[PDB]
Amino acid sequence: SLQVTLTLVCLAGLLMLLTVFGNVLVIIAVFTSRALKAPQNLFLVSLASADILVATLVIPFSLANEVMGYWYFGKAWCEIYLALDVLFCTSSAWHLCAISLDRYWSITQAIEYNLKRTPRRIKAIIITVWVISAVISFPPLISIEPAEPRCEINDQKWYVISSCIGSFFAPCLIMILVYVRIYQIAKRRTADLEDNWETLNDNLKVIEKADNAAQVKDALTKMRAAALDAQKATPPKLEDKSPDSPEMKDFRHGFDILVGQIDDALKLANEGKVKEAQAAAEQLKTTRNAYIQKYLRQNREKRFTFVLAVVIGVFVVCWFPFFFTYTLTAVGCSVPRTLFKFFFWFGYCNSSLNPVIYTIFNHDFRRAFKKILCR
Ligand SMILES: CCS(=O)(=O)N1CCC[C@@H]2CN3CCc4cc(OC)ccc4[C@@H]3C[C@@H]21
């Protein structure tokens, strides 16, 4: 059917190998670590097990129907083929939605939800998501469309809408509405410390380009107020630490040292020694960066929620134009055949793009993959 064929099937086999290899590496990395992975990561193996299931049981049949024609072998072929092909996409979307709800509840109610985060509760959520995904994916007896039954799903004007908002749109909307609240909560929690940090930076730049003792003295006084205010804050890395913790003591003592160096710089500035005060300002800038800047980072939980956020973003980016045009055809809109094919082709390669996100943005997953590969 195509001018060249071996190139496309080698491409698809390359894609299937990447999906299987990456997702089975994720599953092994999650299950083999000695208390390094939590039950809240059980969803990551279900989403991974779905990606493997979509690489060995979904994309090869579509590849064959694309090159050799839609030669489905039996009516049960298109039946289970379209059923599992929609089930895996629906289960992936609802798994991402349940993950976003898991992060939201773990943030809002730490102690309470941590007590209800048992592996039994997580396994029950996974089974429930799989069950409701199989229910939503199952159509009301309108299966497809047995001599030459091309695996082309039915396109009812009022079934396309139900299936799309039941699989993609509702989970994506809910998970987006969840992560925007996660983003707002994080920024509201770090706003005051970021304000004090930006005040310290602006007054340091003022002293950098200052030319008289009045400017540097004023900036140092405002820095003293900013440093004392930031000292009473809780940095993002130490968000779950005690006041007697050595890092919290180091954070407090670091701003104590910064205030002391500001007092010394003010003693220099009041004597008219502008250049000496500016040099002391550069020294306390380095001291502040060396003492505090490591605590401005997020903890492991916040970094992983960001990783799951960009995973949701990749999932939406891969599947949105497909559902968008597939819904547009229901209300009377024209789309090219090759373009309409490549739109869900972007959704297929999401299964292989999912494991590599962990290697890019996470250090534990990348270390576990390196450990499995090296030894
Ligand atoms: C040519 C008819 S098709 O275009 O329908 N073709 C049938 C074979 C499988 C192909 C890829 N799968 C990806 C998952 C998916 C989910 C849907 O709702 C969630 C709806 C369709 C599909 C498509 C159908 C597509």
mmCIF file of C-alpha atoms and ligand atoms in Angstrom:
data_model
loop_
_atom_site.group_PDB
_atom_site.id
_atom_site.type_symbol
_atom_site.label_atom_id
_atom_site.label_comp_id
_atom_site.label_asym_id
_atom_site.label_seq_id
_atom_site.Cartn_x
_atom_site.Cartn_y
_atom_site.Cartn_z
ATOM 1 C CA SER A 1 0.000 0.000 0.000
ATOM 2 C CA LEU A 2 3.049 2.219 0.517
ATOM 3 C CA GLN A 3 6.043 2.929 -1.701
ATOM 4 C CA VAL A 4 8.374 1.730 1.064
ATOM 5 C CA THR A 5 7.289 -0.521 3.913
ATOM 6 C CA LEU A 6 10.316 -1.915 5.776
ATOM 7 C CA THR A 7 11.107 1.577 7.090
ATOM 8 C CA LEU A 8 7.727 2.023 8.787
ATOM 9 C CA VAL A 9 7.649 -1.422 10.409
ATOM 10 C CA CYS A 10 11.203 -0.927 11.695
ATOM 11 C CA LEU A 11 10.072 2.434 13.082
ATOM 12 C CA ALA A 12 7.133 0.802 14.869
ATOM 13 C CA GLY A 13 9.315 -2.002 16.218
ATOM 14 C CA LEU A 14 11.765 0.633 17.439
ATOM 15 C CA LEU A 15 8.850 2.365 19.177
ATOM 16 C CA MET A 16 7.554 -0.872 20.711
ATOM 17 C CA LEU A 17 11.032 -1.789 21.967
ATOM 18 C CA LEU A 18 11.440 1.634 23.597
ATOM 19 C CA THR A 19 8.052 1.318 25.312
ATOM 20 C CA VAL A 20 8.595 -2.230 26.592
ATOM 21 C CA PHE A 21 12.190 -1.593 27.677
ATOM 22 C CA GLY A 22 11.498 1.689 29.455
ATOM 23 C CA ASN A 23 8.312 0.616 31.224
ATOM 24 C CA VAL A 24 9.637 -2.774 32.344
ATOM 25 C CA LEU A 25 12.660 -0.880 33.668
ATOM 26 C CA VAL A 26 10.322 1.424 35.603
ATOM 27 C CA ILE A 27 8.425 -1.542 37.065
ATOM 28 C CA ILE A 28 11.608 -3.360 38.097
ATOM 29 C CA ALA A 29 13.120 -0.173 39.534
ATOM 30 C CA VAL A 30 10.018 0.486 41.646
ATOM 31 C CA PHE A 31 9.629 -3.068 42.967
ATOM 32 C CA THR A 32 13.297 -3.922 43.628
ATOM 33 C CA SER A 33 14.393 -0.945 45.743
ATOM 34 C CA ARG A 34 14.895 -1.594 49.465
ATOM 35 C CA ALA A 35 12.268 0.746 50.938
ATOM 36 C CA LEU A 36 13.186 3.502 48.468
ATOM 37 C CA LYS A 37 9.779 3.478 46.729
ATOM 38 C CA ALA A 38 6.475 4.143 48.516
ATOM 39 C CA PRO A 39 3.045 2.560 47.921
ATOM 40 C CA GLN A 40 2.050 5.858 46.281
ATOM 41 C CA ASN A 41 4.323 4.814 43.391
ATOM 42 C CA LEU A 42 2.198 1.699 42.783
ATOM 43 C CA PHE A 43 0.279 3.734 40.199
ATOM 44 C CA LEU A 44 3.540 4.198 38.297
ATOM 45 C CA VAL A 45 3.762 0.463 37.599
ATOM 46 C CA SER A 46 0.087 0.252 36.592
ATOM 47 C CA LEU A 47 0.503 3.151 34.173
ATOM 48 C CA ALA A 48 3.677 1.379 33.032
ATOM 49 C CA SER A 49 1.995 -2.026 32.725
ATOM 50 C CA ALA A 50 -0.648 -0.315 30.585
ATOM 51 C CA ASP A 51 2.023 1.172 28.306
ATOM 52 C CA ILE A 52 3.592 -2.255 27.765
ATOM 53 C CA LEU A 53 0.112 -3.637 27.081
ATOM 54 C CA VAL A 54 -0.366 -0.915 24.435
ATOM 55 C CA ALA A 55 2.970 -1.735 22.740
ATOM 56 C CA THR A 56 2.523 -5.508 22.354
ATOM 57 C CA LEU A 57 -1.256 -5.701 21.907
ATOM 58 C CA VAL A 58 -2.331 -2.423 20.252
ATOM 59 C CA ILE A 59 0.270 -0.726 18.036
ATOM 60 C CA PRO A 60 1.308 -3.859 16.048
ATOM 61 C CA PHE A 61 -2.253 -4.465 14.836
ATOM 62 C CA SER A 62 -2.604 -0.805 13.837
ATOM 63 C CA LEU A 63 0.757 -1.012 12.065
ATOM 64 C CA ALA A 64 -0.461 -4.024 10.081
ATOM 65 C CA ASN A 65 -3.758 -2.312 9.220
ATOM 66 C CA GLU A 66 -1.719 0.687 7.999
ATOM 67 C CA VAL A 67 0.652 -1.191 5.653
ATOM 68 C CA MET A 68 -1.137 -4.373 4.532
ATOM 69 C CA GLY A 69 -4.622 -2.851 4.670
ATOM 70 C CA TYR A 70 -7.314 -3.289 7.299
ATOM 71 C CA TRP A 71 -7.217 -7.086 7.021
ATOM 72 C CA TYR A 72 -8.674 -7.899 10.418
ATOM 73 C CA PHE A 73 -8.677 -11.654 11.025
ATOM 74 C CA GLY A 74 -12.130 -12.312 12.468
ATOM 75 C CA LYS A 75 -14.743 -10.060 13.992
ATOM 76 C CA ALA A 76 -13.272 -10.778 17.426
ATOM 77 C CA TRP A 77 -10.092 -9.169 16.094
ATOM 78 C CA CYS A 78 -11.571 -5.663 15.802
ATOM 79 C CA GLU A 79 -13.653 -6.354 18.921
ATOM 80 C CA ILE A 80 -10.856 -6.933 21.441
ATOM 81 C CA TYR A 81 -8.529 -4.661 19.441
ATOM 82 C CA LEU A 82 -10.692 -1.536 19.685
ATOM 83 C CA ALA A 83 -11.770 -2.486 23.217
ATOM 84 C CA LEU A 84 -8.274 -2.703 24.706
ATOM 85 C CA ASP A 85 -7.012 0.201 22.584
ATOM 86 C CA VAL A 86 -9.603 2.502 24.159
ATOM 87 C CA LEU A 87 -9.270 0.846 27.582
ATOM 88 C CA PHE A 88 -5.536 1.551 27.843
ATOM 89 C CA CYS A 89 -5.933 5.224 26.912
ATOM 90 C CA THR A 90 -8.853 5.653 29.323
ATOM 91 C CA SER A 91 -6.996 3.832 32.105
ATOM 92 C CA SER A 92 -3.916 6.000 31.532
ATOM 93 C CA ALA A 93 -5.957 9.205 31.772
ATOM 94 C CA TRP A 94 -7.840 8.115 34.892
ATOM 95 C CA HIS A 95 -4.623 6.857 36.495
ATOM 96 C CA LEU A 96 -3.105 10.308 35.975
ATOM 97 C CA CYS A 97 -6.257 11.844 37.459
ATOM 98 C CA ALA A 98 -6.073 9.569 40.507
ATOM 99 C CA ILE A 99 -2.359 10.355 40.867
ATOM 100 C CA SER A 100 -3.072 14.097 40.833
ATOM 101 C CA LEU A 101 -5.729 13.557 43.506
ATOM 102 C CA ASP A 102 -3.191 11.534 45.497
ATOM 103 C CA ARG A 103 -0.683 14.395 45.437
ATOM 104 C CA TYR A 104 -3.362 16.976 46.267
ATOM 105 C CA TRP A 105 -4.573 15.041 49.314
ATOM 106 C CA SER A 106 -1.027 14.290 50.492
ATOM 107 C CA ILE A 107 -0.352 18.043 50.375
ATOM 108 C CA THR A 108 -3.591 19.311 51.926
ATOM 109 C CA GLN A 109 -3.895 16.747 54.749
ATOM 110 C CA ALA A 110 -0.438 15.356 55.501
ATOM 111 C CA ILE A 111 -0.990 13.299 58.661
ATOM 112 C CA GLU A 112 -4.520 12.080 57.913
ATOM 113 C CA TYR A 113 -3.949 11.018 54.301
ATOM 114 C CA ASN A 114 -0.582 9.460 55.180
ATOM 115 C CA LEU A 115 -2.464 7.166 57.569
ATOM 116 C CA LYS A 116 -4.927 6.232 54.799
ATOM 117 C CA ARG A 117 -2.128 5.778 52.216
ATOM 118 C CA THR A 118 -1.833 2.055 52.940
ATOM 119 C CA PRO A 119 -0.870 -0.298 50.083
ATOM 120 C CA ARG A 120 -4.318 -1.887 50.415
ATOM 121 C CA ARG A 121 -5.989 1.462 49.716
ATOM 122 C CA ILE A 122 -3.683 2.117 46.754
ATOM 123 C CA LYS A 123 -4.341 -1.325 45.259
ATOM 124 C CA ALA A 124 -8.084 -0.783 45.696
ATOM 125 C CA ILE A 125 -7.820 2.545 43.861
ATOM 126 C CA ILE A 126 -5.911 0.913 40.995
ATOM 127 C CA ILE A 127 -8.473 -1.886 40.674
ATOM 128 C CA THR A 128 -11.343 0.612 40.818
ATOM 129 C CA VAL A 129 -9.750 2.778 38.113
ATOM 130 C CA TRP A 130 -9.252 -0.279 35.898
ATOM 131 C CA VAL A 131 -12.861 -1.364 36.463
ATOM 132 C CA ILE A 132 -14.398 2.039 35.724
ATOM 133 C CA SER A 133 -12.060 2.415 32.738
ATOM 134 C CA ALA A 134 -13.335 -0.884 31.332
ATOM 135 C CA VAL A 135 -16.909 0.296 31.928
ATOM 136 C CA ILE A 136 -16.408 3.693 30.284
ATOM 137 C CA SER A 137 -14.530 2.155 27.349
ATOM 138 C CA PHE A 138 -17.228 -0.471 26.749
ATOM 139 C CA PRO A 139 -19.807 1.000 24.334
ATOM 140 C CA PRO A 140 -23.565 0.267 24.449
ATOM 141 C CA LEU A 141 -23.376 -2.589 21.903
ATOM 142 C CA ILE A 142 -22.167 -0.332 19.043
ATOM 143 C CA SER A 143 -18.875 -2.165 18.660
ATOM 144 C CA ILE A 144 -17.213 -1.068 15.411
ATOM 145 C CA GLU A 145 -17.933 0.037 11.830
ATOM 146 C CA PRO A 146 -17.467 -10.063 9.156
ATOM 147 C CA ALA A 147 -16.319 -10.734 5.589
ATOM 148 C CA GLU A 148 -13.972 -7.728 5.330
ATOM 149 C CA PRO A 149 -14.607 -5.802 8.568
ATOM 150 C CA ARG A 150 -12.021 -3.023 8.695
ATOM 151 C CA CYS A 151 -11.187 -2.154 12.312
ATOM 152 C CA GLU A 152 -12.690 1.325 12.042
ATOM 153 C CA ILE A 153 -14.542 2.303 15.203
ATOM 154 C CA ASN A 154 -18.087 3.609 14.950
ATOM 155 C CA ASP A 155 -18.577 7.373 14.642
ATOM 156 C CA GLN A 156 -22.027 8.147 16.014
ATOM 157 C CA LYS A 157 -22.670 11.866 16.431
ATOM 158 C CA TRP A 158 -23.695 11.365 20.081
ATOM 159 C CA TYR A 159 -21.346 8.509 21.032
ATOM 160 C CA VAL A 160 -18.084 10.230 20.056
ATOM 161 C CA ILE A 161 -18.817 13.027 22.535
ATOM 162 C CA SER A 162 -19.606 10.628 25.384
ATOM 163 C CA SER A 163 -16.507 8.490 24.817
ATOM 164 C CA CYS A 164 -14.182 11.494 24.503
ATOM 165 C CA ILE A 165 -15.364 13.340 27.616
ATOM 166 C CA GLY A 166 -15.515 10.000 29.434
ATOM 167 C CA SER A 167 -11.918 9.062 28.633
ATOM 168 C CA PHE A 168 -9.814 12.164 27.923
ATOM 169 C CA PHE A 169 -11.615 15.418 28.672
ATOM 170 C CA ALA A 170 -13.055 14.812 32.150
ATOM 171 C CA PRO A 171 -9.880 13.279 33.685
ATOM 172 C CA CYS A 172 -7.639 15.869 32.017
ATOM 173 C CA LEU A 173 -9.850 18.752 33.162
ATOM 174 C CA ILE A 174 -9.986 17.431 36.732
ATOM 175 C CA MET A 175 -6.245 16.734 36.930
ATOM 176 C CA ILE A 176 -5.471 20.178 35.491
ATOM 177 C CA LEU A 177 -7.855 21.794 37.985
ATOM 178 C CA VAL A 178 -6.017 19.843 40.694
ATOM 179 C CA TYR A 179 -2.479 20.811 39.682
ATOM 180 C CA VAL A 180 -3.321 24.509 39.304
ATOM 181 C CA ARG A 181 -4.392 24.449 42.957
ATOM 182 C CA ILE A 182 -1.160 22.603 43.767
ATOM 183 C CA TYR A 183 0.790 25.348 41.987
ATOM 184 C CA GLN A 184 -1.133 28.114 43.767
ATOM 185 C CA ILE A 185 -0.599 26.513 47.186
ATOM 186 C CA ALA A 186 3.138 26.100 46.581
ATOM 187 C CA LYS A 187 3.581 29.710 45.450
ATOM 188 C CA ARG A 188 1.501 31.106 48.318
ATOM 189 C CA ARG A 189 3.620 29.064 50.736
ATOM 190 C CA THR A 190 6.954 30.322 49.347
ATOM 191 C CA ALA A 191 5.855 33.882 48.524
ATOM 192 C CA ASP A 192 7.136 35.562 51.698
ATOM 193 C CA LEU A 193 10.600 33.981 51.555
ATOM 194 C CA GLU A 194 10.893 34.766 47.840
ATOM 195 C CA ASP A 195 9.971 38.367 48.681
ATOM 196 C CA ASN A 196 12.737 38.623 51.288
ATOM 197 C CA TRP A 197 15.206 36.991 48.890
ATOM 198 C CA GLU A 198 14.339 39.429 46.102
ATOM 199 C CA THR A 199 14.702 42.374 48.492
ATOM 200 C CA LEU A 200 18.175 41.135 49.437
ATOM 201 C CA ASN A 201 19.100 40.832 45.743
ATOM 202 C CA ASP A 202 17.838 44.295 44.732
ATOM 203 C CA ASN A 203 19.674 45.994 47.623
ATOM 204 C CA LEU A 204 22.846 44.027 46.778
ATOM 205 C CA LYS A 205 22.612 45.345 43.203
ATOM 206 C CA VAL A 206 22.010 48.848 44.603
ATOM 207 C CA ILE A 207 25.267 48.618 46.582
ATOM 208 C CA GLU A 208 26.970 47.200 43.472
ATOM 209 C CA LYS A 209 26.152 50.332 41.443
ATOM 210 C CA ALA A 210 26.139 52.726 44.411
ATOM 211 C CA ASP A 211 28.358 55.815 44.433
ATOM 212 C CA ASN A 212 27.974 57.299 47.934
ATOM 213 C CA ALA A 213 27.697 56.166 51.539
ATOM 214 C CA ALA A 214 24.002 57.043 51.874
ATOM 215 C CA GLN A 215 22.871 54.559 49.213
ATOM 216 C CA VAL A 216 24.875 51.614 50.560
ATOM 217 C CA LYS A 217 23.902 52.371 54.165
ATOM 218 C CA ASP A 218 20.215 52.500 53.229
ATOM 219 C CA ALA A 219 20.441 49.258 51.244
ATOM 220 C CA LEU A 220 22.247 47.538 54.121
ATOM 221 C CA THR A 221 19.538 48.644 56.561
ATOM 222 C CA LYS A 222 16.806 47.277 54.287
ATOM 223 C CA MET A 223 18.848 44.089 53.916
ATOM 224 C CA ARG A 224 19.017 43.761 57.706
ATOM 225 C CA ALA A 225 15.220 43.922 57.911
ATOM 226 C CA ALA A 226 14.875 41.471 55.020
ATOM 227 C CA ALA A 227 17.352 38.995 56.521
ATOM 228 C CA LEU A 228 15.634 39.053 59.920
ATOM 229 C CA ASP A 229 12.287 38.496 58.197
ATOM 230 C CA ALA A 230 13.611 35.617 56.085
ATOM 231 C CA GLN A 231 15.161 34.060 59.201
ATOM 232 C CA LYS A 232 11.671 33.480 60.641
ATOM 233 C CA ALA A 233 10.590 31.648 57.470
ATOM 234 C CA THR A 234 10.689 27.923 56.720
ATOM 235 C CA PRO A 235 12.630 27.088 53.528
ATOM 236 C CA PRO A 236 11.069 24.723 50.971
ATOM 237 C CA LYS A 237 13.656 21.971 51.495
ATOM 238 C CA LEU A 238 13.126 22.034 55.281
ATOM 239 C CA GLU A 239 9.324 22.131 54.997
ATOM 240 C CA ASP A 240 8.950 18.967 57.121
ATOM 241 C CA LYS A 241 11.785 19.502 59.614
ATOM 242 C CA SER A 242 11.888 20.283 63.328
ATOM 243 C CA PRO A 243 13.392 23.418 64.899
ATOM 244 C CA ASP A 244 15.954 21.211 66.663
ATOM 245 C CA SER A 245 16.916 19.701 63.303
ATOM 246 C CA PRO A 246 20.533 20.497 62.342
ATOM 247 C CA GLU A 247 19.475 21.942 58.980
ATOM 248 C CA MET A 248 16.928 24.293 60.553
ATOM 249 C CA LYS A 249 19.619 25.352 63.025
ATOM 250 C CA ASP A 250 21.976 25.884 60.083
ATOM 251 C CA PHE A 251 19.329 27.978 58.313
ATOM 252 C CA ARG A 252 18.802 30.144 61.406
ATOM 253 C CA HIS A 253 22.528 30.462 62.126
ATOM 254 C CA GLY A 254 23.230 31.347 58.494
ATOM 255 C CA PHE A 255 20.969 34.390 58.688
ATOM 256 C CA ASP A 256 22.514 35.232 62.065
ATOM 257 C CA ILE A 257 25.907 35.356 60.337
ATOM 258 C CA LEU A 258 24.421 37.394 57.484
ATOM 259 C CA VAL A 259 23.006 39.968 59.912
ATOM 260 C CA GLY A 260 26.375 40.166 61.660
ATOM 261 C CA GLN A 261 28.153 40.798 58.362
ATOM 262 C CA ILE A 262 25.544 43.442 57.510
ATOM 263 C CA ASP A 263 26.326 45.165 60.815
ATOM 264 C CA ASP A 264 30.037 45.135 59.960
ATOM 265 C CA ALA A 265 29.296 46.544 56.502
ATOM 266 C CA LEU A 266 27.186 49.282 58.102
ATOM 267 C CA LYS A 267 30.100 50.105 60.413
ATOM 268 C CA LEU A 268 32.234 50.529 57.288
ATOM 269 C CA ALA A 269 29.611 52.582 55.441
ATOM 270 C CA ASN A 270 29.136 55.066 58.294
ATOM 271 C CA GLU A 271 32.877 55.841 58.122
ATOM 272 C CA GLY A 272 32.570 56.908 54.469
ATOM 273 C CA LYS A 273 34.553 53.887 53.212
ATOM 274 C CA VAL A 274 32.216 53.183 50.308
ATOM 275 C CA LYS A 275 34.446 50.769 48.379
ATOM 276 C CA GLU A 276 35.177 48.736 51.515
ATOM 277 C CA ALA A 277 31.459 48.511 52.305
ATOM 278 C CA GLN A 278 30.730 47.350 48.752
ATOM 279 C CA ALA A 279 33.417 44.671 49.060
ATOM 280 C CA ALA A 280 31.867 43.530 52.342
ATOM 281 C CA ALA A 281 28.502 43.476 50.556
ATOM 282 C CA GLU A 282 29.927 41.097 47.949
ATOM 283 C CA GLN A 283 31.349 38.920 50.731
ATOM 284 C CA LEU A 284 28.020 38.634 52.561
ATOM 285 C CA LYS A 285 26.328 37.899 49.229
ATOM 286 C CA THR A 286 28.617 34.891 48.793
ATOM 287 C CA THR A 287 28.056 33.919 52.434
ATOM 288 C CA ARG A 288 24.277 34.087 51.985
ATOM 289 C CA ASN A 289 24.412 31.981 48.813
ATOM 290 C CA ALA A 290 26.668 29.369 50.410
ATOM 291 C CA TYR A 291 24.548 29.124 53.582
ATOM 292 C CA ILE A 292 20.932 29.445 52.426
ATOM 293 C CA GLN A 293 20.609 28.749 48.694
ATOM 294 C CA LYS A 294 20.726 24.967 49.191
ATOM 295 C CA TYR A 295 17.578 25.228 51.341
ATOM 296 C CA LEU A 296 15.664 27.169 48.665
ATOM 297 C CA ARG A 297 15.275 23.926 46.698
ATOM 298 C CA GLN A 298 12.162 21.791 46.998
ATOM 299 C CA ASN A 299 12.064 18.536 48.933
ATOM 300 C CA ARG A 300 11.708 15.125 47.283
ATOM 301 C CA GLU A 301 7.901 15.219 47.380
ATOM 302 C CA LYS A 302 7.546 18.595 45.655
ATOM 303 C CA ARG A 303 10.123 17.693 42.997
ATOM 304 C CA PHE A 304 8.271 14.467 42.195
ATOM 305 C CA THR A 305 4.916 16.259 42.005
ATOM 306 C CA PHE A 306 6.557 18.509 39.413
ATOM 307 C CA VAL A 307 7.754 15.389 37.577
ATOM 308 C CA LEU A 308 4.209 14.022 37.596
ATOM 309 C CA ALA A 309 3.011 17.455 36.460
ATOM 310 C CA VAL A 310 5.195 17.423 33.331
ATOM 311 C CA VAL A 311 4.107 13.816 32.766
ATOM 312 C CA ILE A 312 0.502 15.035 32.767
ATOM 313 C CA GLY A 313 1.555 17.827 30.415
ATOM 314 C CA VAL A 314 3.189 15.368 28.018
ATOM 315 C CA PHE A 315 0.116 13.118 28.176
ATOM 316 C CA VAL A 316 -2.217 16.015 27.370
ATOM 317 C CA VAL A 317 0.064 17.326 24.609
ATOM 318 C CA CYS A 318 0.235 13.875 23.006
ATOM 319 C CA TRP A 319 -3.502 13.117 23.106
ATOM 320 C CA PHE A 320 -5.228 16.523 22.905
ATOM 321 C CA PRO A 321 -5.161 17.198 19.117
ATOM 322 C CA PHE A 322 -6.416 13.662 18.468
ATOM 323 C CA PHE A 323 -9.477 13.987 20.712
ATOM 324 C CA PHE A 324 -9.934 17.566 19.482
ATOM 325 C CA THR A 325 -10.288 16.661 15.802
ATOM 326 C CA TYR A 326 -12.105 13.396 16.554
ATOM 327 C CA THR A 327 -14.764 15.466 18.320
ATOM 328 C CA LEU A 328 -14.738 18.028 15.500
ATOM 329 C CA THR A 329 -15.700 15.348 12.963
ATOM 330 C CA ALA A 330 -18.861 14.621 14.968
ATOM 331 C CA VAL A 331 -20.192 18.152 14.351
ATOM 332 C CA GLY A 332 -19.203 18.179 10.670
ATOM 333 C CA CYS A 333 -15.536 18.986 10.064
ATOM 334 C CA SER A 334 -13.032 17.709 7.510
ATOM 335 C CA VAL A 335 -9.584 16.340 8.372
ATOM 336 C CA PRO A 336 -7.006 14.654 6.100
ATOM 337 C CA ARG A 337 -6.474 10.921 6.454
ATOM 338 C CA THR A 338 -2.702 11.053 6.982
ATOM 339 C CA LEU A 339 -3.032 14.007 9.364
ATOM 340 C CA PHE A 340 -5.802 12.281 11.330
ATOM 341 C CA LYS A 341 -3.573 9.196 11.522
ATOM 342 C CA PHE A 342 -0.535 11.090 12.823
ATOM 343 C CA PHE A 343 -2.638 12.808 15.496
ATOM 344 C CA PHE A 344 -3.181 9.586 17.444
ATOM 345 C CA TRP A 345 0.261 8.407 16.328
ATOM 346 C CA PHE A 346 1.428 11.153 18.691
ATOM 347 C CA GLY A 347 -0.693 9.563 21.412
ATOM 348 C CA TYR A 348 0.845 6.146 20.767
ATOM 349 C CA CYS A 349 4.444 7.296 21.281
ATOM 350 C CA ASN A 350 3.407 8.720 24.670
ATOM 351 C CA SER A 351 3.952 5.251 26.152
ATOM 352 C CA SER A 352 7.655 5.356 25.245
ATOM 353 C CA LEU A 353 8.011 9.047 26.123
ATOM 354 C CA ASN A 354 6.677 8.355 29.628
ATOM 355 C CA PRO A 355 9.619 6.376 31.125
ATOM 356 C CA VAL A 356 12.322 8.736 29.834
ATOM 357 C CA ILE A 357 10.763 11.651 31.744
ATOM 358 C CA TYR A 358 11.841 9.941 34.968
ATOM 359 C CA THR A 359 15.441 9.666 33.759
ATOM 360 C CA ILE A 360 15.467 13.334 32.725
ATOM 361 C CA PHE A 361 13.905 14.936 35.802
ATOM 362 C CA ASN A 362 14.363 12.368 38.606
ATOM 363 C CA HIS A 363 17.591 11.074 40.137
ATOM 364 C CA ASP A 364 16.301 7.931 41.877
ATOM 365 C CA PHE A 365 14.746 6.468 38.723
ATOM 366 C CA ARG A 366 17.864 7.317 36.708
ATOM 367 C CA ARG A 367 20.129 5.770 39.354
ATOM 368 C CA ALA A 368 17.999 2.613 39.453
ATOM 369 C CA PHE A 369 18.093 2.333 35.656
ATOM 370 C CA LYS A 370 21.875 2.756 35.738
ATOM 371 C CA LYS A 371 22.094 0.069 38.433
ATOM 372 C CA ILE A 372 20.018 -2.415 36.422
ATOM 373 C CA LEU A 373 22.021 -1.694 33.263
ATOM 374 C CA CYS A 374 25.524 -1.681 34.770
ATOM 375 C CA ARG A 375 25.373 -4.847 36.890
HETATM 376 C C1 LIG B 1 -9.525 4.111 11.670
HETATM 377 C C2 LIG B 1 -10.601 4.187 12.757
HETATM 378 S S1 LIG B 1 -9.914 4.960 14.267
HETATM 379 O O1 LIG B 1 -9.425 6.372 13.937
HETATM 380 O O2 LIG B 1 -11.043 5.039 15.294
HETATM 381 N N1 LIG B 1 -8.585 4.004 14.774
HETATM 382 C C3 LIG B 1 -9.034 2.621 15.052
HETATM 383 C C4 LIG B 1 -7.844 1.775 15.483
HETATM 384 C C5 LIG B 1 -7.169 2.306 16.733
HETATM 385 C C6 LIG B 1 -6.729 3.708 16.358
HETATM 386 C C7 LIG B 1 -5.998 4.374 17.526
HETATM 387 N N2 LIG B 1 -6.867 4.461 18.716
HETATM 388 C C8 LIG B 1 -6.248 5.268 19.780
HETATM 389 C C9 LIG B 1 -7.196 5.268 20.972
HETATM 390 C C10 LIG B 1 -8.432 5.794 20.671
HETATM 391 C C11 LIG B 1 -9.252 6.251 21.693
HETATM 392 C C12 LIG B 1 -10.521 6.740 21.404
HETATM 393 O O3 LIG B 1 -11.328 7.221 22.394
HETATM 394 C C13 LIG B 1 -10.713 7.136 23.686
HETATM 395 C C14 LIG B 1 -10.966 6.745 20.086
HETATM 396 C C15 LIG B 1 -10.155 6.252 19.068
HETATM 397 C C16 LIG B 1 -8.892 5.748 19.363
HETATM 398 C C17 LIG B 1 -8.064 5.279 18.326
HETATM 399 C C18 LIG B 1 -8.855 4.644 17.166
HETATM 400 C C19 LIG B 1 -7.905 4.558 15.975
#
